[PDB]
């Protein structure tokens, strides 16, 4: 067989029913992101004369 | 499995019953069959001899 990948000829045994040289590449990506931020202020005063 | 029951009509039986902590908190039931039945070994004993 001539492999269309790695670009070479190869020999096969009578033990293998089929050696194919198809290519498939299947990719799945998941990227998930969070960010959060807070700020707070309180003040009081109580006064006399 | 509970170890195979003695043969009847050429078949054994065995039972497994999810006896570890059960499917809980809404989790899916155990993946499989509770009981199996299989043909007995007497054909080896008679035939291969």
């Amino acid at each position: 067989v001539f492999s269309g990948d790695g670009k070479d000829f190869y020999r096969l045994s009578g033990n293998v029913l089929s050696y194919t040289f198809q290519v498939k590449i299947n990719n799945d990506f998941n990227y998930e992101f969070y960010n959060s931020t807070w700020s707070y202020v309180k003040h009081t005063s109580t006064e006399h004369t | 499995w509970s170890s195979w029951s003695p043969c009847v009509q050429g078949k054994k039986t065995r039972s497994r019953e999810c006896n570890n902590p059960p499917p809980s908190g809404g989790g899916r039931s155990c993946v499989g069959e509770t009981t199996e039945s299989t043909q007995c070994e007497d054909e080896e004993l008679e035939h291969l001899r």
Partner: protein
């Protein structure tokens, strides 16, 4: 509103245990002068499904 003030509850036990099922969670909403004034009732989602 800072809607991330409110609770990161766990998701509810899966409604259908093994087919096309759903789960939900909610903010454990306690109303306060903050919630009333800072548009929280308007912009925050109370429950996620």
């Amino acid at each position: 509103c800072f809607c991330d003030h409110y609770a990161w509850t766990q998701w509810t036990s899966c409604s259908k245990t093994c087919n096309s099922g759903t789960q939900s969670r909610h903010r454990q909403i306690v109303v306060d002068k903050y919630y009333q004034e800072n548009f929280c009732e308007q912009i925050c989602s109370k429950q996620e499904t």
